[PDB]
Write a protein that holds these residues in place. Structure first.
Motif, mmCIF file in Angstrom:
data_model
loop_
_atom_site.group_PDB
_atom_site.id
_atom_site.type_symbol
_atom_site.label_atom_id
_atom_site.label_comp_id
_atom_site.label_asym_id
_atom_site.label_seq_id
_atom_site.Cartn_x
_atom_site.Cartn_y
_atom_site.Cartn_z
ATOM 1 N N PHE A 5 0.962 -1.003 0.238
ATOM 2 C CA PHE A 5 0.033 0.080 -0.013
ATOM 3 C C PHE A 5 0.889 1.250 -0.119
ATOM 4 C CE2 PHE A 5 -2.215 -3.462 2.438
ATOM 5 C CZ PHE A 5 -3.175 -3.708 1.732
ATOM 6 N N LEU A 9 1.340 1.800 -5.705
ATOM 7 C CA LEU A 9 0.074 1.505 -5.869
ATOM 8 C C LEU A 9 -0.828 2.739 -5.930
ATOM 9 C CD1 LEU A 9 -1.232 -1.347 -5.859
ATOM 10 C CD2 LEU A 9 -2.378 -0.613 -3.648
ATOM 11 N N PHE A 10 -0.658 3.715 -5.196
ATOM 12 C CA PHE A 10 -1.646 4.855 -5.328
ATOM 13 C C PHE A 10 -1.451 5.638 -6.986
ATOM 14 C CE2 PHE A 10 -0.101 5.933 -0.733
ATOM 15 C CZ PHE A 10 -0.757 4.802 -0.449
ATOM 16 N N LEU A 13 -3.541 3.000 -9.123
ATOM 17 C CA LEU A 13 -4.855 3.271 -8.797
ATOM 18 C C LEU A 13 -5.532 4.681 -9.843
ATOM 19 C CD1 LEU A 13 -5.466 1.944 -5.521
ATOM 20 C CD2 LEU A 13 -6.817 1.286 -7.184
ATOM 21 N N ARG A 30 -5.428 7.901 5.258
ATOM 22 C CA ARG A 30 -4.750 6.952 4.584
ATOM 23 C C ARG A 30 -3.478 6.481 5.451
ATOM 24 N NH1 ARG A 30 -3.806 9.643 0.001
ATOM 25 N NH2 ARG A 30 -1.801 10.006 0.335
ATOM 26 N N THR A 33 -4.095 4.318 8.241
ATOM 27 C CA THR A 33 -4.616 2.926 7.662
ATOM 28 C C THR A 33 -3.631 1.993 7.416
ATOM 29 O OG1 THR A 33 -6.887 3.387 7.477
ATOM 30 C CG2 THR A 33 -6.228 1.885 6.011
ATOM 31 N N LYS A 36 -1.629 0.553 9.983
ATOM 32 C CA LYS A 36 -2.298 -0.363 10.675
ATOM 33 C C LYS A 36 -1.939 -1.711 9.606
ATOM 34 C CE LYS A 36 -6.567 -2.145 11.846
ATOM 35 N NZ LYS A 36 -8.088 -2.174 11.763
ATOM 36 N N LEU A 37 -2.002 -1.772 8.399
ATOM 37 C CA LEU A 37 -1.808 -2.765 7.516
ATOM 38 C C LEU A 37 -0.465 -3.038 7.184
ATOM 39 C CD1 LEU A 37 -4.276 -1.513 4.695
ATOM 40 C CD2 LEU A 37 -4.737 -2.921 6.675
ATOM 41 N N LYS A 58 1.793 -7.549 -5.600
ATOM 42 C CA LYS A 58 0.768 -8.537 -5.736
ATOM 43 C C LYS A 58 -0.595 -7.715 -6.263
ATOM 44 C CE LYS A 58 0.998 -12.885 -3.901
ATOM 45 N NZ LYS A 58 0.795 -13.851 -2.599
ATOM 46 N N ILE A 59 -0.928 -6.599 -5.308
ATOM 47 C CA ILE A 59 -2.101 -5.541 -5.467
ATOM 48 C C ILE A 59 -1.946 -5.089 -6.994
ATOM 49 C CG2 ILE A 59 -3.737 -4.199 -4.752
ATOM 50 C CD1 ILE A 59 -2.582 -4.885 -2.012
ATOM 51 N N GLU A 61 -0.394 -6.307 -9.674
ATOM 52 C CA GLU A 61 -0.518 -7.331 -10.645
ATOM 53 C C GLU A 61 -2.053 -7.464 -10.684
ATOM 54 O OE1 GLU A 61 1.965 -10.577 -9.555
ATOM 55 O OE2 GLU A 61 3.837 -9.521 -9.634
ATOM 56 N N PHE A 62 -2.627 -7.391 -9.533
ATOM 57 C CA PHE A 62 -4.171 -7.764 -9.604
ATOM 58 C C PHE A 62 -4.927 -6.592 -10.287
ATOM 59 C CE2 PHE A 62 -8.200 -6.850 -7.547
ATOM 60 C CZ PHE A 62 -8.924 -7.918 -7.846
ATOM 61 N N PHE B 5 -8.146 -11.477 -2.702
ATOM 62 C CA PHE B 5 -8.580 -11.197 -4.044
ATOM 63 C C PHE B 5 -9.893 -12.232 -4.315
ATOM 64 C CE2 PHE B 5 -3.805 -10.636 -4.218
ATOM 65 C CZ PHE B 5 -3.979 -9.481 -4.484
ATOM 66 N N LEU B 37 -2.305 -15.584 -7.922
ATOM 67 C CA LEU B 37 -2.255 -14.787 -7.058
ATOM 68 C C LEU B 37 -2.264 -15.600 -5.838
ATOM 69 C CD1 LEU B 37 -3.495 -11.549 -8.077
ATOM 70 C CD2 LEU B 37 -1.185 -11.875 -7.996
ATOM 71 N N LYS B 58 -6.819 -6.870 4.142
ATOM 72 C CA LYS B 58 -6.181 -5.790 4.152
ATOM 73 C C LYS B 58 -6.574 -4.791 3.245
ATOM 74 C CE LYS B 58 -2.319 -7.404 6.768
ATOM 75 N NZ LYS B 58 -0.827 -7.084 6.863
#
Lengths: 213, 206
Positions: A5, A9-10, A13, A30, A33, A36-37, A58-59, A61-62, B5, B37, B58
């Motif tokens: 995060f 990633l921002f 998005l 933000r 959060t 925390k993550l 990974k996010i 990639e998703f 996901f 993933l 998360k």
């Protein structure tokens, strides 16, 4: 590995068309959060000397796979070279800034300069798409805005947050700036800083400064 | 933990207005991406007996924080009870469906029914927003889908599908709260369009 995060990633998005509210209240919510993550740390970690320069998100990639054409723009670079350009800069920065022996500072600074220079050469050499384009002033010098062309790609989402961190921490803690002679790197950073997707997702200097004490 | 996901995450995305094309080909590609993933498995894992009912996503927490008002709708529930209603159903299901001993089946099923009934009661009891009686609201927390529904609905749906296939068990019609909740959810494309078909579910837990 690194907190996924992240400004990288921002940027993904925002470039996909999923933008954030631009207020300090949102920045704080933000940041709290993500604390925390990613309790271990939120900005990219300094590398150790022998570490390969991969940093999988990974996010990211998703999102690139699932937020795809036609509804969303594809952000992957077209030229494979774009995905590795400048990847060693955070590493050379890491070795330079972790060092407290004055005797090693000159060799390490040169290592960082050399990696910057490699990037600069990538940025000033024409890409395939530029083959029949005309350079503004000097023949065969690239004028594209970013790594892979005139649009931000995934490769820029990884590199620009890191370059920006390098600049802030080196300026603050070493009085090192990227030479103005690296005109390609400076053009790149200037074009980036003019894009809301980068500027609005940028942590202020103080969050970067405090992160790397 | 569970693959982040997931249908839950997709629901959150669609409820924020971040949607996808849903054709059999687009759906297949997404499924493939998530397999890569989450090679370990994509649908929520069955719980072990001593496991707590927590299931932290998360990426969901991140999305709620950043895709927030005024640009996006808030999805967090207002009533804290909403965030725990039915959390134990997947655990009761897990005990029930893992058991191979026919003599233990009837009383594991009772535990599952009892957990469905606690949910039913929550769904039929008026929330504070509804006070002066049976509740007429569509979802856990009111008439809008919340994050709590994004977690619970995929799981409840899997319980329904798997239990029907492998035990001939169905949620009693008499649990009107539960039945109306599922009907209202199935009528919303944020749930339907992100829902794996019965074969994918059945085969995943076979």
């Amino acid at each position: 590995g690194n907190c996924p995060f992240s400004q990288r990633l921002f940027m993904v998005l925002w470039l996909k068309g999923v933008t954030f509210n631009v207020t300090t209240v949102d920045t704080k919510r933000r940041t709290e959060t993500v604390q925390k993550l990613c309790p271990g740390g939120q900005l990219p970690f300094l590398l150790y000397g022998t570490e390969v320069h991969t940093d999988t998100n990974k996010i990211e990639e998703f999102l690139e796979a699932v937020l795809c054409p036609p509804r969303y723009p594809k952000l992957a670079a077209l030229n494979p070279e774009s995905n590795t350009a400048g990847l060693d800069i955070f590493a050379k920065f890491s070795a330079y800034i972790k060092n407290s022996n004055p005797a090693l500072n000159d060799n390490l600074e040169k290592g960082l300069l050399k990696a910057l220079k490699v990037l600069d050469n990538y940025l000033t050499s024409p890409l395939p798409e530029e083959v029949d384009e005309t350079s503004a002033e000097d023949e065969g010098v690239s004028q594209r805005k970013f790594l892979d062309g005139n649009e931000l790609t995934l490769a820029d989402c990884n590199l620009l947050p890191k370059l920006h961190i390098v600049q802030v921490v080196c300026k603050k803690y070493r009085g090192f700036t990227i030479p103005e002679a690296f005109r390609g790197v400076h053009r790149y950073l200037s074009n980036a800083y003019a894009r809301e997707e980068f500027a609005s997702t940028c942590p202020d200097d103080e969050e970067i400064e405090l992160a790397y004490e």
